[PDB]
């Protein structure tokens, strides 16, 4: 199906304690493949997926240098932004950046994106056309005009439409066992009483890849988000994912409450009733 | 593969 390659960068300042913490992570779909932590031993980009160690010394050499260059911009970004909002030297603040690309099931380019946040809300974003910027406030307006002047989006678009899709494709064929597999969810259902006149029905989905899954509850046709409790999709930690959904039932009526499971690795969408 | 050209804000 669709695939993606995304990189995630967090920088957090440590006043009185030192140079900021920098963490970078690369994903293809929902498989992390590389990392860099500013606090780790090696001070290099490190592998995280089997299929990426067939890249030569050149690759790692290069990726270390680029992630250190990223680290450096973020280091400086934290100080610039502190000046932009006239904040004190004493406070710890947060920069996050995320960029990447989507391809379709022909593997041709689909979407490209580059997002930026300061203290967990949006700062500046590359718009969908990859030519222009959305700025969040007056302080980001400075950054917007600087990035217009320094031709950033030009370089970004060249990467996102080009290199980003060229390397994703390489990665996908390098990790064909790993990445091109889809694992169907192994389903399950439980039941425990809450009161005397009340029951809870819990749909379950285990061991699926990828993480995109829909679980929905419904009585008799018309679907339900009124008693519905969903948990967030959580990793099992072996590379597969898990999720559940619960509803409170006026008990005796657990005949006519049904559960819908939607996932990419399912030939048919699953209808599950409590037997 | 990472982006080659990051610029300050």
């Amino acid at each position: 199906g669709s695939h993606s390659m995304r990189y995630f960068f967090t920088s957090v300042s440590r006043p009185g304690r030192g140079e900021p913490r920098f963490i970078a992570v690369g994903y293809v779909d929902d498989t992390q493949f590389v990392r860099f932590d500013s606090d780790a031993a090696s001070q290099r980009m490190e592998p995280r997926a089997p299929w990426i160690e067939q890249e030569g010394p050149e690759y790692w050499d290069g990726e270390t240098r680029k992630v250190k260059a990223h680290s450096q911009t973020h280091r400086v970004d934290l100080g610039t932004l502190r000046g932009y909002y006239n904040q004190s030297e004493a406070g710890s603040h947060t920069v996050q950046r995320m960029y990447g690309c989507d391809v379709g099931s022909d593997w041709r380019f689909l979407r490209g994106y580059h997002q930026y946040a300061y203290d967990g809300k949006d700062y500046i974003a590359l718009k969908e056309d990859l030519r222009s910027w959305t700025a969040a406030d007056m302080a980001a307006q400075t950054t917007k005009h600087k990035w217009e002047a320094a031709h950033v989006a030009e370089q970004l678009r060249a990467y996102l439409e080009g290199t980003c899709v060229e390397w994703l494709r390489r990665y996908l064929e390098n990790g064909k066992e790993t990445l091109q597999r889809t694992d169907a969810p192994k389903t399950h259902m439980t039941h425990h009483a809450v009161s005397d006149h009340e029951a809870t029905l819990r749909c379950w989905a285990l061991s699926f890849y990828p993480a995109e899954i829909t679980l929905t509850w419904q009585r008799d046709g018309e679907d339900q988000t009124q008693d519905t409790e969903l948990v967030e999709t959580r990793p099992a930690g072996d590379g597969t994912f898990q999720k559940w959904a619960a509803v409170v039932v006026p008990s005796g009526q657990e005949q006519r409450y049904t559960c819908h499971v939607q996932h990419e690795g399912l030939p048919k969408p699953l209808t599950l009733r409590w037997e | 593969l990472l982006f080659g050209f990051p610029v300050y804000v």
Partner: T-cell receptor
Amino acid sequence: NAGVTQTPKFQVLKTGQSMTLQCAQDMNHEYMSWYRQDPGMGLRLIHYSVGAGITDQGEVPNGYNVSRSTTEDFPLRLLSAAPSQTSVYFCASRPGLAGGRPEQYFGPGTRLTVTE
Amino acid sequence: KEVEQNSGPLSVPEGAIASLNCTYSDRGSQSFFWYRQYSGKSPELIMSIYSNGDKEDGRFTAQLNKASQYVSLLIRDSQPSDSATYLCAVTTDSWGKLQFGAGTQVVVTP
């Protein structure tokens, strides 16, 4: 803008003399490099500097010394000139992280001859 | 040897097409440059290309094929003042050094 300026255009030295070659850049670039060019070898990197205050060597750094005390100025100096330094020296500059349109622009050059 | 260039010297008459080739060896290269350098003076930037396909700028046309690791330069409609040596340059990032070819010397005969 003036771009990259270099000084001087031509020079002679005898074996043992010292000489500094000036270089300047107008564009708030962080990344500056010194090269030499020779008839058999093409461009070879001598030293280079990816920000103010900081510098590191390249493939041919022996006998040349470099310092980058400001963003704008990157002087190369030779302390004991030798006849293997008879060459053409070019300065070059590149934006670094400051304004990333990735092209590197060279200076006009210093043509240099050292004789016994 | 990282950047491999067209051997030279390359002689074409005036009005002709001067085609220049260049292959490189680092796959993760992301920026690509043609330089002009007349004898006696300094390398002058004439063409920058960033992604696969053709960039046209007056008489110059640079093309790029990242997949076969090849950059080219066409000089359409040649003046005799196009006689120089033409340098191929390749980089991977802001902080990765610019890799230079040896140069192809191009003579435009009248």
